[PDB]
Design a protein around this ligand. Structure first.
Ligand code: MOO
Ligand code: MOO
Ligand SMILES: [Cl-]
Lengths: 256, 255
């Protein structure tokens, strides 16, 4: 149903971790024998003793000493935890980024966001940092959406701006939680916010305390916003509205 | 240390992709022919071929075609997916390549470290303990990785289902600084869906904004961006209560 990937780990032009090799380090921890491990995994205490004296060496920490004066070392234990994990990634990055005509939309950042974690934000957009100040506490950056026609002002702490490398040209991902988006026909109300997105209500579902207003954007895309009732009562479908939100109500996401 | 990660990819229990088959396909794209495309990589012009149609054998497609040989849409893709995965795994290694800095052996905690990075100054790992069925906006309750403090979050119904946010599900809590206030009027604190008592450890004053750092009983640090407007009585080493609402937090889960 799938395919199997094998993680080979080379350390300074040579070999360090082979699937069969990690199998040895694990079988030597469950057997506790210099050989029984080499045995419990298709090796002959040779490709095993040779792949170890050369594995302890290449490694910055002995992975298996003797017994008391075949036993491992904490670092040998972390190597197993590390590899196995590095093995899990593969499968998922592979399971995701899976294939074909069905899913695909952009590259690197756009593709990593596909297997990486996912957020509850109903509005996620890709853009590019076109500017940024240098306020000692809170800074503001300008983002030009992948549509090259939409501008947005976002605010983040300086420590954050510095670590994500939000410099000019940086490709980002705008995470806007539906509740941070307002809908209005009152161009005045929309114009008081830092961000405005014109559009028409393509759908409106009214709950008991909240309402999910879906807005069709000139893009074709849909902006989602959760508006209370005492604010989303006059709103109707097919109406020309304007989504608005302030710069401090947005999260940024970069690979850095 | 100073390590490279060569990636061996196999399907149907057979060598499908290999760094060499890739350099084979990449040079076929550079030279345009299998002929040169072979030497410019690693001999056997007279082998590469059964190796290219063996992959055309393993995928049912025809990775590479044929004056000379031109890659396919599936050939360049498979080339981009390998190289892509080649980076991902390289990073994953390097970011994680530590001596004692574990992501709680959680794919989540681990993935979060090398994959997309967010600007939220407050990110805590937790586990969903509950969730309602309200049609429009639901509410999930979280129990952080300290098994004590419970948070309450609000998400759209589609987000609740699309992520599988049910009991036991592991999540990462994203809380941007500006959505967190810090008071002492228990009336303000108790009024917010969320409240976390602490003690101010530092206060960065600015022309209009302040950056208050409160140390959580955890021993960590919560960060809030407070308008000097709402930071007139805030001082250092003071027992305060940080507060935020349920609809001001984003959840990040796996798949
Ligand atoms: O599901 Mo959200 O986090 O309200 O956009
Ligand atoms: O630095 Mo922020 O204000 O948590 O995105
Ligand atoms: Cl509701």
């Amino acid at each position: 149903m799938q395919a199997e990937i094998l993680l080979t780990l080379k350390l300074q032009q040579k070999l360090f971790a082979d699937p069969r090799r990690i199998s040895l380090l694990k079988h030597i921890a469950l057997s506790g024998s210099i050989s029984q491990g080499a045995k419990d995994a298709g090796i002959s205490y040779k490709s095993a003793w040779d792949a170890i004296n050369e594995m302890n060496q290449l490694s910055e920490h002995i992975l298996v000493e003797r017994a008391t004066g075949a036993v491992l070392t904490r670092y040998g234990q972390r190597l197993i935890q590390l590899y196995d994990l590095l093995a899990q990634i593969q499968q998922k990055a592979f399971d995701v980024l899976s294939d074909d005509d069905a899913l695909p939309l952009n590259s690197l950042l756009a593709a990593i966001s596909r297997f990486s974690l996912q957020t509850s934000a109903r509005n996620q957009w890709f853009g590019t940092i076109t500017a940024r100040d240098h306020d000692d506490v809170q800074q503001h950056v300008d983002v030009l959406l992948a549509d090259g026609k939409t501008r947005l002002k976002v605010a983040i702490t300086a420590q954050s701006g510095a670590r994500l490398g939000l410099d000019e040209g940086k490709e980002v991902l705008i995470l806007l939680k539906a509740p941070w988006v307002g809908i209005t026909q009152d161009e005045a109300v929309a114009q008081n916010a830092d961000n405005q997105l014109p559009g028409i209500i393509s759908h409106i579902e009214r709950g008991a305390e909240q309402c999910e207003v879906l807005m069709a954007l000139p893009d074709g895309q849909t902006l989602c916003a959760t508006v209370p009732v005492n604010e989303a009562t006059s709103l109707q479908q097919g109406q020309n509205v304007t989504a608005y939100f302030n710069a401090d109500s947005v999260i940024i996401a970069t690979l850095c």
